Swiss-Prot record:
GTP binds at residues 10-18, 29-35, 59-60, 116-119. Belongs to the small GTPase superfamily. Ras family. It comes from the Eukaryota. The modification N-acetylthreonine is found at residue 2. It is a lipid-anchor. Glycans are attached at residue 35. It catalyses: GTP + H2O = GDP + phosphate + H(+). Keywords: Acetylation, Cardiomyopathy, Cell membrane, Cytoplasm, Deafness, Disease variant, Ectodermal dysplasia, Glycoprotein, GTP-binding, Hydrolase, Intellectual disability, Isopeptide bond, Lipoprotein, Membrane, Methylation, Nucleotide-binding, Palmitate, Prenylation, Proto-oncogene, Ubl conjugation. GO terms for molecular function: G protein activity; GDP binding; GMP binding; GTP binding; GTPase activity; identical protein binding; LRR domain binding; protein-containing complex binding. Changing residue 59 to T: In GASC; also found in bladder cancer; somatic mutation. Changing residue 22 to R: In NS3; impairs GTPase-activating protein stimulated GTP hydrolysis with unaffected intrinsic functions and a virtually functional effector interaction. It holds the Pfam family Ras. This is GTPase KRas. The gene is KRAS.
Length: 169
């Protein structure tokens, strides 16, 4: 009854593919081709309404392309993924947000900030610092583990709720 294009972004190694493959195939990948980009589909009921999700798992290279702009423009909501043990990945979030804003030609784009790898003890990004970032962006923040599945469905489903909220703006 409604289709949603979701796009998963963030630095290399943060767990984009792991999170996506957990959601879709219900297993954790220890190693997955670091540059392949593909889309996945899945149907989910969220708040009583059937959602047909088309999920783009981004990767590729550190480069601009008009082709990438074109697929990114199709996205209706974005997961901004960092790893909680990788401060550089957190620092990179700003860039991803900016580039989304660019291609969507909009400051108000449905997004969720995702702190992945929450199962690891060696955290270098505080929950508070993320929460404050997400506050400044006006978006939710969810901590996930693709390894244990903690928060995986929540991250994706919260993004759909964000998209729904926006489509009524
Ligand atoms: C390990 C491979 C990997 O996961 N990645 C490769 C580097 N990526 C990446 N690097 C820099 N900038 C990126 C970027 F700006 C976008 C982006 C564009 O170009 C337009 C609109 C919205 C965007 F997020 C993307 Cl998709 C990837 C970028 C990805 C991570
Ligand atoms: N411990 C832990 N490792 C993870 C988690 N998510 C991803 N990884 C690992 O981190 C590495 C990169 O994951 P991947 O999904 O390929 O990252 P991507 O480059 O963002 O697509 C892999 O070794 C994964 O097994 C997580 O939640 N916990
Ligand atoms: Ca990947
Ligand atoms: Ca404009
Ligand atoms: Ca601005
Ligand atoms: Ca908002």
């Amino acid at each position: 009854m409604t289709e949603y294009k979701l796009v998963v972004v963030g630095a290399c190694g943060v767990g984009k593919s792991a999170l996506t493959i957990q959601l879709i195939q219900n297993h954790f990948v220890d190693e997955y081709d670091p540059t392949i980009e593909d889309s996945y589909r899945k149907q989910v009921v969220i708040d009583g309404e059937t959602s047909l999700l088309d999920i783009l798992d981004t990767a590729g290279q550190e480069e601009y392309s008009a082709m990438r702009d074109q697929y990114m423009r199709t996205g209706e909501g974005f997961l901004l993924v960092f790893a909680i043990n990788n401060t550089k990945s957190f620092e990179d979030i700003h860039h991803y947000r900016e580039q989304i804003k660019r291609v969507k030609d909009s400051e108000d784009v449905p997004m969720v900030l995702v702190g992945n790898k929450s199962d690891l003890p060696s955290r270098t990004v505080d929950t508070k610092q993320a929460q404050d970032l997400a506050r400044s962006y006006g978006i939710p923040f969810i901590e996930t583990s693709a390894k244990t599945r903690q928060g995986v469905d929540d991250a994706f489903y919260t993004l759909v709720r964000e998209i729904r909220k926006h489509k009524e703006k």
